[PDB]
Amino acid sequence: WTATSGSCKGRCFELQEVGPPDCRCDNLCKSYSSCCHDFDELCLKTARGWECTKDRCGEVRNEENACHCSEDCLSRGDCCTNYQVVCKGESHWVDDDCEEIKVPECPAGFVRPPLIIFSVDGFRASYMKKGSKVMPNIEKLRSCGTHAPYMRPVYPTKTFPNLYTLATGLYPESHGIVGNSMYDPVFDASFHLRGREKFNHRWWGGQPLWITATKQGVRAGTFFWSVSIPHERRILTILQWLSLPDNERPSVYAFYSEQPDFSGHKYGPFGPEMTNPLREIDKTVGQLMDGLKQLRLHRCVNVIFVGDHGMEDVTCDRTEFLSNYLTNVDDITLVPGTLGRIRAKSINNSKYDPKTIIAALTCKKPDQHFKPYMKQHLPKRLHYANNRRIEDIHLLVDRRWHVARKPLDVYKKCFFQGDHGFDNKVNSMQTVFVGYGPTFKYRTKVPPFENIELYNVMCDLLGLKPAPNNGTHGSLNHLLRTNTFRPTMPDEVSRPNYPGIMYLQSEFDLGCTCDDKVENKLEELNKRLHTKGSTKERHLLYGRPAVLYRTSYDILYHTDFESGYSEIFLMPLWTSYTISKQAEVSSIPEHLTNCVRPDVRVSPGFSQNCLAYKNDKQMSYGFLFPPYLSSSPEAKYDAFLVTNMVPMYPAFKRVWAYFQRVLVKKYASERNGVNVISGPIFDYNYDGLRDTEDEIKQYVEGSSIPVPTHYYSIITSCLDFTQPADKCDGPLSVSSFILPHRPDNDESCNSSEDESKWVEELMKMHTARVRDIEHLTGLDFYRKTSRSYSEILTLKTYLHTYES
Numbered sequence: 001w002t003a004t005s006g007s008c009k010g011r012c013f014e015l016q017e018v019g020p021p022d023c024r025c026d027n028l029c030k031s032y033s034s035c036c037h038d039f040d041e042l043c044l045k046t047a048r049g050w051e052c053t054k055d056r057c058g059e060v061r062n063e064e065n066a067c068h069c070s071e072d073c074l075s076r077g078d079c080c081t082n083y084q085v086v087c088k089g090e091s092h093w094v095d096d097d098c099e100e101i102k103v104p105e106c107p108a109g110f111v112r113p114p115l116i117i118f119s120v121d122g123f124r125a126s127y128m129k130k131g132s133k134v135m136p137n138i139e140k141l142r143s144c145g146t147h148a149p150y151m152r153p154v155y156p157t158k159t160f161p162n163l164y165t166l167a168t169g170l171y172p173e174s175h176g177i178v179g180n181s182m183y184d185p186v187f188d189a190s191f192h193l194r195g196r197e198k199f200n201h202r203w204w205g206g207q208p209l210w211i212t213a214t215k216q217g218v219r220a221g222t223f224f225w226s227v228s229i230p231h232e233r234r235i236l237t238i239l240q241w242l243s244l245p246d247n248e249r250p251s252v253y254a255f256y257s258e259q260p261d262f263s264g265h266k267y268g269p270f271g272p273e274m275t276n277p278l279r280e281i282d283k284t285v286g287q288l289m290d291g292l293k294q295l296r297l298h299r300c301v302n303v304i305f306v307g308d309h310g311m312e313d314v315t316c317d318r319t320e321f322l323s324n325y326l327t328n329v330d331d332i333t334l335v336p337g338t339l340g341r342i343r344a345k346s347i348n349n350s351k352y353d354p355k356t357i358i359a360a361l362t363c364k365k366p367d368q369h370f371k372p373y374m375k376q377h378l379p380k381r382l383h384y385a386n387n388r389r390i391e392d393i394h395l396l397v398d399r400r401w402h403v404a405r406k407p408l409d410v411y412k413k414c415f416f417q418g419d420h421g422f423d424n425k426v427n428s429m430q431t432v433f434v435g436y437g438p439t440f441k442y443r444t445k446v447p448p449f450e451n452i453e454l455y456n457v458m459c460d461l462l463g464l465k466p467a468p469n470n471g472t473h474g475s476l477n478h479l480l481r482t483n484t485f486r487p488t489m490p491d492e493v494s495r496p497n498y499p500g501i502m503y504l505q506s507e508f509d510l511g512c513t514c515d516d517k518v519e520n521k522l523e524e525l526n527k528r529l530h531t532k533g534s535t536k537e538r539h540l541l542y543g544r545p546a547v548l549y550r551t552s553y554d555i556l557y558h559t560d561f562e563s564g565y566s567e568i569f570l571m572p573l574w575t576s577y578t579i580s581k582q583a584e585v586s587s588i589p590e591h592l593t594n595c596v597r598p599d600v601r602v603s604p605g606f607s608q609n610c611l612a613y614k615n616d617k618q619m620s621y622g623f624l625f626p627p628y629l630s631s632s633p634e635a636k637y638d639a640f641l642v643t644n645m646v647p648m649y650p651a652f653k654r655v656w657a658y659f660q661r662v663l664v665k666k667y668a669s670e671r672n673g674v675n676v677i678s679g680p681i682f683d684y685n686y687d688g689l690r691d692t693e694d695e696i697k698q699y700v701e702g703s704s705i706p707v708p709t710h711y712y713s714i715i716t717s718c719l720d721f722t723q724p725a726d727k728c729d730g731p732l733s734v735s736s737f738i739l740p741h742r743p744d745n746d747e748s749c750n751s752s753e754d755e756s757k758w759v760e761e762l763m764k765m766h767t768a769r770v771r772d773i774e775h776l777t778g779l780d781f782y783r784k785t786s787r788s789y790s791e792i793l794t795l796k797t798y799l800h801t802y803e804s
């Protein structure tokens with residue numbers, strides 16, 4: 001109930017929301033059906049439109065007018081945005097030469113540069129180039145300010161997930177808005193775009209920027225606008241708030257446009273009908289910038305132009321139907337479209353089996369336009385699993401396609417020509433970032449980055465301490481002229497042991513054998529120097545990783561590689577090796593095929609054993625440093641040490657062997673040498689974070705050898721590939737992956753073919769940021785470079801995407 005009998009007299013777009021049953025006059029009252037009777041009359045004036053004309057200049061103030069051209073309007077803070085242009089012979093902001101803003105130029109009483117976020121729905125990255133002719137205001141922001149060629153959204157590339165990620169710095173799995181549509185089984189409640197449940201506070205986790213601001217005594221404008229409030233009125237409301245007295249005036253504001261998404265859905269991303277939407281957004285930006293210029297704030301305010309996601313070509317004819325795969329289609333609920341989420345229709349149906357559904361949806365049709373996953377098997381880069389609102393069964397849908405349950409769902413609902421929601425590495429899903437103002441750099445291009453990073457920066461721009469989030473604070477310092485955040489490197493928690501030779505061969509009863517009984521003062525001292533780390537400078541280029549948790553581990557040095565060996569997990573946390581452009585691949589000799597060798601530096605009781613692998617009929621083993629890249633026949637024996645061995649399913653060993661035999665050398669050839677750090681990952685609770693030992697659900701049978709969920713590699717080289725990896729003077733280049741350790745290759749529909757036709761495709765799907773691996777391992781990499789720390793943070797957030 002609302003008592004709509006109150007009045008918005010003097011309360012229009014009030015910042016403090018009053019509570020029921022008192023009637024509301026804020027920019028959301030409409031969305032709750034709660035506005036006072038007179039809100040439209042007083043607050044949504046339209047008379048005479050949005051522009052001054054010659055004839056209105058110096059008019060008698062008529063309070064019925066939507067905006068004013070009277071002499072008192074600047075002082076009232078309610079001129080039309082073009083008032084000074086039409087009436088005072090000023091120029092439009094866009095017509096002004098762009099001049100560097102070295103310092104804030106703010107009116108008296110402004111404590112800090114205000115931040116205005118100009119957010120645009122469905123604004124595809126390539127619109128900045130392809131639409132440049134019809135977007136002069138936006139192109140001046142872009143060219144004179146700081147811009148990225150694109151910004152990467154989060155998965156799924158839907159509106160509420162991405163806007164709330166922008167607001168919080170969190171992955172959707174953490175903030176709780178994991179889709180446009182959701183069922184929470186704990187609440188027994190459904191979130192939808194239509195209706196009132198979505199307003200319930202229990203859906204919305206984390207702490208959005210407007211709350212972070214308020215709590216730290218920075219006042220905020222309200223970020224959400226009721227759909228019926230026209231854009232011109234949104235802009236005028238913002239400009240009015242900026243004329244409030246200092247004690248009352250917000251420091252942070254958001255504008256939102258439903259365009260170009262709205263038209264994009266109807267016409268497709270590049271439909272001829274898309275030009276006018278882009279012109280209209282640009283005019284709105286023009287209005288803002290002209291309005292700021294009038295208020296003398298155009299060289300004071302920091303303005304962010306940012307999108308939530310892009311737009312792809314999608315038609316009703318490109319729909320896959322689960323009814324063409326499942327017999328049992330009526331026993332499931334599907335969340336459909338550009339992703340699929342599947343659960344049981346009834347929790348009383350005990351005949352529901354996810355295993356049988358996945359199998360019926362796996363590599364069934366030659367050109368199949370979706371791939372089923374258990375959510376914990378999704379690429380770790382998507383960070384899309386650790387929430388009860390994310391169904392166990394997920395369908396990754398190919399770009400340009402939809403999935404639906406049955407055909408009748410499509411036509412008893414072609415209409416639409418665009419959609420979004422796909423994998424966030426897809427080029428069509430990428431969106432835009434521009435920053436303009438005193439705190440941003442001048443005419444600066446920055447590399448693409450992820451929208452999870454922005455919250456931190458908005459906090460920096462406002463002098464706020466960010467709530468804990470999934471950004472890496474300092475990774476975007478290169479966007480900023482001032483207000484940079486200068487972090488220290490985390491302190492190492494666990495110092496390594498450096499074991500010498502402590503055990504005789506006969507002390508080991510591992511059930512391993514090696515044909516290595518083959519016998520020199522010249523070379524005898526040489527191998528001693530290798531085991532004490534005489535080659536470690538070559539193989540450990542950026543310092544040893546720091547272990548950021550309490551554990552017991554040993555540094556082991558070798559001719560060709562160095563490792564940090566966990567006495568707890570009985571395997572390396574990391575193995576580091578450098579492969580030059582000139583390096584030769586060799587085979588595993590016939591006589592050494594099944595060779596495993598005790599490591600006389602490590603006690604039997606902290607070693608793996610071969611008998612456990614013999615008895616475990618499902619589990620085999622591989623090596624972290626590859627025997628194929630041994631520098632000499634004698635050095636190759638090091639590669640068969642029990643301390644280099646890790647558990648691997650035979651199916652995964654196909655993937656691993658091809659990576660180690662073919663791809664590493666390929667990358668060294670292409671990149672002028674590479675440094676590789678490989679190791680295991682344990683994430684059995686799919687939270688993106690390093691497991692403790694008590695969270696491991698699977699061991700090699702009859703043993704305490706824990707089974708990794710994933711294997712990682714970090715592959716670093718010189719950005720200037722005219723320098724070799726091991727003698728790089730300048731910035732680095734990295735690519736990484738986190739490969740799921742699976743007992744089958746069902747994910748790869750062409751896996752019965754040669755590894756040359758599918759393995760590298762798998763690895764590209766499982767591309768990762770170094771930062772992803774840090775979370776999953778509790779390691780901190782790149783501790784000892786000649787690079788600034790902020791630059792290294794940027795490197796650690798880089799994702800190699802493999803798009804054109």
Ligand SMILES: *[C@@H]1O[C@H](CO)[C@@H](O[C@@H]2O[C@H](CO)[C@@H](O[C@@H]3O[C@H](CO[C@H]4O[C@H](CO)[C@@H](O)[C@H](O[C@H]5O[C@H](CO)[C@@H](O)[C@H](O)[C@@H]5O[C@H]5O[C@H](CO)[C@@H](O)[C@H](O)[C@@H]5O)[C@@H]4O)[C@@H](O)[C@H](O[C@H]4O[C@H](CO)[C@@H](O)[C@H](O)[C@@H]4O[C@H]4O[C@H](CO)[C@@H](O)[C@H](O)[C@@H]4O)[C@@H]3O)[C@H](O)[C@H]2NC(C)=O)[C@H](O)[C@H]1NC(C)=O
Pocket residue numbers: 170171173174175176202203204205206383386387388468469470687688689775
């Ligand atoms: C991305 O960044 C985020 C933010 O930094 C990272 O997420 C954090 O990770 C931490 C570890 O997983 C986690 O810390 C825990 O906090 C528990 C209390 O959490 C509440 O309080 C915070 C602060 O206000 C709040 O933000 C939380 O919000 C979550 O939950 C609500 C609803 O419940 C949602 O509205 C919201 O979206 C959010 O959901 C997400 O997080 C939860 C986890 O809390 C997930 O389950 C969801 O799926 C979703 O992802 C909470 O309201 C605290 O209780 C924990 O302490 C336990 O563990 C320690 C271990 O030492 C132990 O000593 C304690 O005893 C305790 O265990 C006890 O409870 C166990 C389980 O009930 C039980 O088994 C034991 O026997 C014990 O009784 C812990 O400290 C933090 O909550 C989140 N924060 C957020 C915002 O998500 C995230 O990791 C980053 N991602 C990556 C990849 O890096």
Ligand SMILES: O=C1c2cnc(N[C@@H]3Cc4ccc(Cl)cc4C3)nc2CN1C1COC1
Pocket residue numbers: 117119159160163164166167223224225226227254255256
């Ligand atoms: O009706 C609306 C609506 C209204 N206002 C908004 N404001 C945006 C929320 C937000 C968050 C972070 C940042 Cl940095 C800027 C902004 C501004 N957003 C929306 C989204 N939406 C529906 C269309 O898809 C859901």
Ligand SMILES: [Ca+2]
Pocket residue numbers: 121122158159160261308309
């Ligand atoms: Ca959107």
Ligand SMILES: [Ca+2]
Pocket residue numbers: 682683684685686687688689690691
């Ligand atoms: Ca974990």
Ligand SMILES: [Cl-]
Pocket residue numbers: 156158178179180181335
């Ligand atoms: Cl969804």
Ligand code: NA
Pocket residue numbers: 613614615616617618619620
């Ligand atoms: Na075996």
Ligand code: NA
Pocket residue numbers: 363745746747748749750751752
């Ligand atoms: Na297969």
Ligand SMILES: [Zn+2]
Pocket residue numbers: 122159261262265420
């Ligand atoms: Zn949309």
